[PDB]
Design a protein around this ligand. Structure first.
Ligand code: HEM
Ligand SMILES: OC[C@H]1O[C@H](O[C@H]2[C@H](O)[C@@H](O)[C@H](OCCCCCC3CCCCC3)O[C@@H]2CO)[C@H](O)[C@@H](O)[C@@H]1O
Ligand SMILES: OC[C@H]1O[C@H](O[C@H]2[C@H](O)[C@@H](O)[C@H](OCCCCCC3CCCCC3)O[C@@H]2CO)[C@H](O)[C@@H](O)[C@@H]1O
Ligand SMILES: C=C1CC[C@@]2(C(C)C)C[C@@H]12
Length: 465
């Protein structure tokens, strides 16, 4: 009958005075030193249980899924989402939204394109755009958000936007700034003291205002889908939801509400755009720092695919090196180092500790991805972390960047397809250069909070021959 151990808190400040200035993640890795894999930290007024290492995390999300499957809050965006949409929902609202989103993120209608096909098409558009740049320097952030946003758009809104569309780019800008502001030092501090800091000016207000501006776009798209809805031929995920709404309207407790429609839709957009693109940004920075890996990846593309046939998912199994590189990009880039917060949904016992219902829990995914027993020298980028003796692909159970269990990333199959196809399709057509010599490329993230965000950089894409 005790919570996990941890540093002794003060009233009001919780463990603030024991924290590391460099962030939550660093704070928690120090605590782990002292207390081991399961400990309690008081983030202002809330005790939060931290679980570290693949064994503890898997034991919680998979073996104790009846208790560890709740969703906790991200203080920076809770005032906006308020438990609407699939990411932030619990209970029956979650079950409904998850079932809906999973099915509709995969089955689209006979004669509608596959996931692979939309990605393949977006990849050709991206290569045509990169050709048109003629080797000019760019920060590729906007293009990497455009291609990942466009895959979600084709599912959600039934169309794609053009790369030079300044309105499309305005919404990409809002998603980008929001993810940065959520992961900033302020955003981390807000996680501790949201109750106090919310009365004052700060980034939380800018985040809230950004999300309302994206929400206004969605609300208008929804209305215009409603006006043109053909109940016999759903175009996209919005039409499918409208039909469920119509079908359940006689139940006042239907979860197909207007607020879930907007916020689930937003949720999918945010997650679909900022995750994969951020991974891509890091991956191309790593290719600049390790041009020998990129050159090896090209050799493999040449031998297995050739210089012109578009890459397809069937190529994956014949490309162990490219796959190792992409896993290692994900491992090293550690997109969500503390995952997304969980909450326990019933009184539970965990390695002797007793964790009461409603206790918030962070799974520190970063500790699995940097576990030195699975990855020798885990702080260095090295695709050999994923290769055996023969150069064959060695997967491992510590590779959990999508989490595990009931709340495991529902975009996983999409993200993996997007990483492989965009990565290989770009390298099939271009090598990369930049004004910064490999030795001087600094990989230090620009933010490290909920999200790990790479520094900005310039790069050129040089066409092959
Ligand atoms: C590199 C790409 C991605 C990574 C590393 C990633 C990682 C994650 C993680 C760690 C979670 C939290 C799981 C948990 O709560 O324990 C999550 C949830 C989620 N992700 Fe992904 N994600 C990626 C791409 C995507 C994409 C492309 C989509 C959209 C198609 C997406 C949609 C979602 C949704 C809707 C949830 C909430 C699931 C739920 O709470 O039921 N993610 N993701
Ligand atoms: O109808 C009234 C409203 O219209 C103007 O806002 C527009 C701007 O006129 C207009 O340029 C705009 O075009 C956006 C198209 C790009 C959509 C990109 C999507 C990417 C995926 C996630 C959703 C957004 O959409 C916004 C919402 O319609 C205004 O911003 C708001 O005043 C006002 O509330
Ligand atoms: O005592 C009653 C109150 O307590 C619950 O919430 C509190 C928590 O009790 C209480 O801890 C809180 O104060 C926290 C002080 C945090 C110190 C400020 C830090 C901010 C920047 C970094 C250094 C200092 O403010 C919140 C709002 O008052 C409630 O939010 C309010 O109902 C209620 O007014
Ligand atoms: C992919 C995700 C899951 C939760 C999240 C928030 C900022 C939308 C970090 C984005």
């Amino acid at each position: 009958g005790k919570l996990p151990p941890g540093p002794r808190p003060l009233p009001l400040l919780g463990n603030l005075l024991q924290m590391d200035r460099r962030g939550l993640l660093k704070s928690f890795l120090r605590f782990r030193e002292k207390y081991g894999d399961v400990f309690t930290v008081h983030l202002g007024p809330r005790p939060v249980v931290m679980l570290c290492g693949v064994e503890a995390i898997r034991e919680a999300l998979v073996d104790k899924a009846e208790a560890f499957s709740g969703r906790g809050k991200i203080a920076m965006v809770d005032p906006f989402f308020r438990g609407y949409g699939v990411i932030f929902a619990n209970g029956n609202r979650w079950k409904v939204l998850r079932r809906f989103s999973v099915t509709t993120m995969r089955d689209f209608g006979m004669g509608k394109r596959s996931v692979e096909e939309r990605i393949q098409e977006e990849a050709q558009c991206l290569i045509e755009e990169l050709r048109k740049s003629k080797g000019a320097l760019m920060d590729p952030t906007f293009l990497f958000q455009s291609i990942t946003a466009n895959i979600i758009c084709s599912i959600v809104f039934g169309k794609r936007f053009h790369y030079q569309d300044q309105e499309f780019l305005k919404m990409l800008n809002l998603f980008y700034q929001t993810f940065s502001l959520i992961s900033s030092v302020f955003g981390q501090l807000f996680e501790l003291f949201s109750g106090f800091l919310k009365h004052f000016p700060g980034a939380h207000r800018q985040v809230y205002k950004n999300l309302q501006e994206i929400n206004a776009y969605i609300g208008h798209s929804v209305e215009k889908h409603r006006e043109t809805l053909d109940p016999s031929a759903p175009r996209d995920l919005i039409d499918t939801y409208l039909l469920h709404m119509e079908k359940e309207k006689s139940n006042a407790h239907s979860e197909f509400s207007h607020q879930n429609l907007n916020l689930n839709t937003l949720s999918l957009f945010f997650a679909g755009t900022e995750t994969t693109s951020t991974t891509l940004r890091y991956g191309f920075l790593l290719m600049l720092k390790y041009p020998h890996v990129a050159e090896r990846v090209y050799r493999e593309i040449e031998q297995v695919i050739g210089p012109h046939r578009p890459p397809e998912l069937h190529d994956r199994a014949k490309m162990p090196y490219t796959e190792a590189v992409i896993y290692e990009i994900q491992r090293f880039s550690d997109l969500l180092p503390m995952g997304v917060p969980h909450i326990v949904t019933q009184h539970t016992s965990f390695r002797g500790y007793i964790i009461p219902k409603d206790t918030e829990v962070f799974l520190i995914l970063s500790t699995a991805l940097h576990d030195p027993h699975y990855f020798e020298k885990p702080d260095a980028f090295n695709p050999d972390h994923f290769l055996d003796a023969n150069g064959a692909l060695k997967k491992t159970e510590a590779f959990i960047p999508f989490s595990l269990g009931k709340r495991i990333c529902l975009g996983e199959g999409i993200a993996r397809a997007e990483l492989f196809l965009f990565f290989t399709t770009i390298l099939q057509n271009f090598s990369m250069a930049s004004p910064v010599a490999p030795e001087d490329i600094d990989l230090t993230p620009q933010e490290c909070g909920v999200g790990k965000i790479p520094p900005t950089y310039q790069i050129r894409f040089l066409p092959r021959h």
